[PDB]
Amino acid sequence: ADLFSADSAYTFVQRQVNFGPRIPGTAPHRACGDWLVATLRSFGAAVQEQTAEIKAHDGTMLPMRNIIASYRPEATGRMLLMAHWDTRPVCDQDANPAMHTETFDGADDGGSGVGVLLEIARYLGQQKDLGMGIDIVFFDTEDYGSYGDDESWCLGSQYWSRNPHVAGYKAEAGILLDMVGAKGATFYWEYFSKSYAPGLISAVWQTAAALGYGNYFIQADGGALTDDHVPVIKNLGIPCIDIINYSSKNEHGFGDHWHTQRDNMQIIDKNVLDAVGETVIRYLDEQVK
Ligand SMILES: [Zn+2]
């Protein structure tokens, strides 16, 4: 475990939570994005913002704000990293049905992904020369949908996959982190990831294995999850995988903190942040020399 600092990654999750819920349209969301952008620029990334007015399933007009951060943007060969940074406006799945109208921190559901990819970004800023381009993409408005309407989620990755920030954008492989910080998390093979990126899924999970993270990266089928990686595979043709906390043996599949007031800084395990983080950076190290 040489290249990735989980303490830094953990602090990055605390800092996002500090603004308050990153609910599209609200002030914290505005502030967090500025700080996201500033922070990425401070790590040497060329940071581009893609904003659009998008209407949600229930007619709310959201100020979508996708954040694209680039290293070596001239390079034709590119590695893609993804995470959603918005917070769902409600803990719809709280054990107490009175909480269903109220907000939660989303430290894992949103925070964790940005936090790891923030700490990767910093590591990138200290690389004298790089052989591939790297795009880190923070999608917005992934968690605003409703449950009976599967294409009301991932609106940010929808918009971006149909209208990338570069004409003919392409990347060799995509990695999406979603809820990678909860204590005791289980990362199984997401079906679409396994289907469209078999070499990618194996290469990552074998890296984890070699690094001794097989208590976290389980080499076995998980779920068929609609996530930000799916639109990217359909519309951009990029083979993507989703490192996401899901188990077929959970009450909700996701961990019990999901869309729950318990999704907060108290649920985050630095060791789980380290496993995902140190795996992805290591896989990224050999793939860009
Ligand atoms: Zn969510």
CATH code, 263: 3.40.630.10
Among candidate residues 254, 263, 253, 239, the one with its CA nearest the CA of residue 102: 263
Q: Where are the beta strands (DSSP E) in the chain?
A: 46-55, 61-71, 78-84, 133-139, 173-178, 187-189, 217-221, 240-244
Amino acid letter, residue 255: G
Distance 258 CA to ligand 1 centre (A): 7
Residue 39 CB neighbour total at 10 angstroms: 18
Known binding site: residues? 2, 4, 109, 143, 259, 274, 278
Distance 234 CA to ligand 1 centre (A): 21
Q: What resolution does the deposited structure have, in angstroms?
A: 2.8
Distance 146 CA to ligand 1 centre (A): 11
Domain range spanning residue 164? Answer: 1-289
Residue 26, SS3 per DSSP: coil
- Environment of ion ligand 1 (residues, CB < 5 A): 88, 109, 143
Task: Identify the experimental approach.
Answer: X-ray
Total structural domains in the chain?
Answer: 1
In sequence order, the β-bridge partners of residue 246 are 254
d(CA 227, CA 209): 24
Amino acid letter, residue 83: A
Residues 6+ away with beta carbon under 8 Å from 23:
29, 86, 87, 88, 89, 103
Judged on CB neighbours under 10 Å (0-12, 13-18, 19+), 274 is buried
* Helices of type H across 6-145: 6-18, 27-42, 113-125
Max CA distance (Å), the chain: 54
Amino acid letter, residue 44: G
CA angle 82, 87, 88 (to 5 degrees): 120
Distance 284 CA to ligand 1 centre (A): 26
Residue 210 CA to its chain's centroid (Å): 23
Distance 143 CA to ligand 1 centre (A): 5
